[PDB]
Design an enzyme around this catalytic site. Structure first.
Site, PDB file in Angstrom:
ATOM      1  N   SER A  44       0.886  -1.226  -0.085  1.00 41.29           N
ATOM      2  CA  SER A  44       0.117   0.124  -0.081  1.00 41.29           C
ATOM      3  C   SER A  44       0.915   1.230  -0.077  1.00 41.29           C
ATOM      4  O   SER A  44       0.049   2.425  -0.105  1.00 41.29           O
ATOM      5  CB  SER A  44      -0.811   0.063   1.217  1.00 41.29           C
ATOM      6  OG  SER A  44      -1.943  -0.953   0.780  1.00 41.29           O
ATOM      7  N   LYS A  47       0.078   3.819  -2.573  1.00 34.29           N
ATOM      8  CA  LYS A  47      -1.079   4.791  -2.797  1.00 34.29           C
ATOM      9  C   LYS A  47      -0.727   6.056  -2.724  1.00 34.29           C
ATOM     10  O   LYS A  47      -1.442   7.154  -3.299  1.00 34.29           O
ATOM     11  CB  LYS A  47      -1.980   4.193  -1.751  1.00 34.29           C
ATOM     12  CG  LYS A  47      -2.637   2.980  -1.640  1.00 34.29           C
ATOM     13  CD  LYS A  47      -3.443   2.643  -0.456  1.00 34.29           C
ATOM     14  CE  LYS A  47      -4.425   1.454  -0.498  1.00 34.29           C
ATOM     15  NZ  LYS A  47      -3.772   0.275  -0.813  1.00 34.29           N
ATOM     16  N   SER A 104      -6.122   3.198   4.019  1.00 33.02           N
ATOM     17  CA  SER A 104      -5.460   2.218   3.259  1.00 33.02           C
ATOM     18  C   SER A 104      -6.459   1.361   2.345  1.00 33.02           C
ATOM     19  O   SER A 104      -6.662   0.239   2.133  1.00 33.02           O
ATOM     20  CB  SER A 104      -4.743   1.314   3.764  1.00 33.02           C
ATOM     21  OG  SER A 104      -3.462   0.880   3.082  1.00 33.02           O
ATOM     22  N   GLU A 140      -5.238  -3.652  -6.763  1.00 32.72           N
ATOM     23  CA  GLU A 140      -5.547  -4.300  -5.417  1.00 32.72           C
ATOM     24  C   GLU A 140      -6.618  -5.151  -5.477  1.00 32.72           C
ATOM     25  O   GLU A 140      -7.708  -5.373  -6.410  1.00 32.72           O
ATOM     26  CB  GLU A 140      -6.126  -3.173  -4.632  1.00 32.72           C
ATOM     27  CG  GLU A 140      -4.922  -2.283  -3.898  1.00 32.72           C
ATOM     28  CD  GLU A 140      -3.992  -2.546  -2.798  1.00 32.72           C
ATOM     29  OE1 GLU A 140      -4.085  -3.832  -2.944  1.00 32.72           O
ATOM     30  OE2 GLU A 140      -3.348  -1.827  -2.711  1.00 32.72           O
ATOM     31  N   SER A 211       1.319  -3.452   3.852  1.00 37.75           N
ATOM     32  CA  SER A 211       1.570  -4.921   4.484  1.00 37.75           C
ATOM     33  C   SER A 211       1.249  -5.847   3.139  1.00 37.75           C
ATOM     34  O   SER A 211       0.133  -5.514   2.511  1.00 37.75           O
ATOM     35  CB  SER A 211       0.758  -4.967   5.579  1.00 37.75           C
ATOM     36  OG  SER A 211      -0.659  -4.681   5.474  1.00 37.75           O
TER      37      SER A 211
END
Length: 262
Positions: A44, A47, A104, A140, A211
């Site tokens: 992440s 992002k 997230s 994602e 993560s």
């Protein structure tokens, strides 16, 4: 080498995994790196680049950030803490950027990616600001597979620290867009146990964690000690077993090593 490098190597060895660190001290333009040019899965932390790419578009698409985006049932992925509240309705790109960065939210990230034309649109923004290392290849959640040897969805600590400096302290974005990115990063809700946990409580931090599989545990941060020029710190960590547990303590420990070395 340096004492800091010895301590980072010892932390890596104790941790069982592979650690990447890059620090930029903007007070004197000095740097510390550990595995600075090795690729790590971003998870992440990518992002940040996607939100910044949309901010860059908003510099010339003056109504983009307030444009309603439909959140369709099929858009919801495993982790959509904000977007799930908006199924069958709309969110603006500003709201999707905040949700991606501060919670997230993976559906929000996928909406940013789609706005940019796909993962290659995030990479294209990286290239436009001079980052030749970053690559985003997937959406994602599959960008988090973090497979050893897979270059997809990776960057290096050196490249990410340089880019984060440009985005938040420099001139990759217009002035108001840069300030907006900084505001969003400072409002991150997911970072307390990572870099932040290794720093004095009086320092102001904007960060984004990541993560993924292989116990991948990442954090990228801009750090303002009181009255001081800021530091940019990236910490990437990944482990040999696909099912390894998260190790945010390793990132906190790396931050503590850096903070004590200030």
């Amino acid at each position: 080498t340096s004492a800091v490098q010895q301590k980072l190597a010892a932390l890596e060895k104790s941790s069982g995994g592979r650690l990447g660190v890059a620090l930029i001290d903007t007070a004197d333009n000095t740097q510390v790196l550990y595995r600075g040019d090795e690729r790590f899965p971003m998870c992440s932390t990518s992002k940040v680049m996607a939100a910044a790419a949309v901010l860059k578009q908003s510099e010339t698409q003056k109504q983009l950030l307030n444009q309603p985006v439909e959140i369709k049932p099929a858009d919801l992925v495993n982790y959509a803490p904000i977007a799930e509240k908006h199924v069958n309705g709309t969110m603006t790109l500003a709201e999707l950027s905040a949700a991606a960065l501060q919670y997230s939210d993976n559906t929000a990230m996928n909406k940013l990616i789609a706005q940019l034309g796909g993962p290659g649109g995030v990479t294209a923004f990286a290239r436009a600001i001079g980052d030749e290392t970053f690559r985003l290849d997937r959406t994602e959640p599959t960008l988090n597979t973090a497979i050893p040897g897979d270059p997809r969805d990776t960057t290096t600590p050196r490249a990410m620290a340089q880019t984060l400096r440009q985005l938040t302290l420099g001139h990759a974005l217009g002035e108001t867009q840069r300030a907006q990115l900084v505001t969003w990063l400072k409002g991150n809700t997911t970072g307390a146990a990572s870099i932040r946990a290794g720093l004095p409580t009086s320092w102001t931090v904007g960060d984004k964690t990541g993560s993924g599989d292989y116990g991948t545990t990442n954090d990228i941060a801009v750090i303002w000690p009181q009255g001081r020029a800021p530091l940019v710190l990236v910490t990437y960590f990944t482990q040999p077993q696909q099912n390894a547990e998260s190790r945010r303590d390793v990132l906190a420990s790396a931050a503590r090593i850096i903070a004590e070395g200030l």
